């Protein structure tokens, strides 16, 4: 596919029940929204090797109808996205968070 296609449904899976099940370092990154920050996903060497360029990462979240980004004027590294939830939040407690 296209670098914005792969991206996109890596972000998607990223979020995904089957992704956050093996992955916990997803869920202790969560906030009290069960937001995680852009410049977290884009440490992923699946991402990386596609593109480091947060911005294209962006779009790529953009593009996904399941996918919600807050935006935050003051840092673009401070750009967070989560995936609608369906059953149940994935959000650790405080202590538990990294």
Not at 67 to 90: F, G, N, Y
Request: aromatic share 12%; no cysteine; hydrophobic share 45%.
């Amino acid at each position: 596919m296209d670098v914005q296609a792969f991206l996109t449904s890596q972000l998607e899976y990223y979020f995904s029940i089957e992704n956050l099940s093996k992955d916990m370092f997803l869920r202790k990154h969560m906030d009290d929204e069960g937001y995680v920050p852009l410049a977290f996903l884009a440490s992923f060497n699946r991402i990386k090797s596609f593109s480091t360029d947060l911005n294209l990462l962006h779009a790529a979240a953009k593009a996904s109808d399941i996918i919600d980004v807050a935006e935050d004027l003051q840092s673009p590294m401070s750009i967070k996205v989560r995936r609608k939830e369906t059953w149940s939040p994935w959000i650790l407690p405080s202590e538990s968070r990294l």
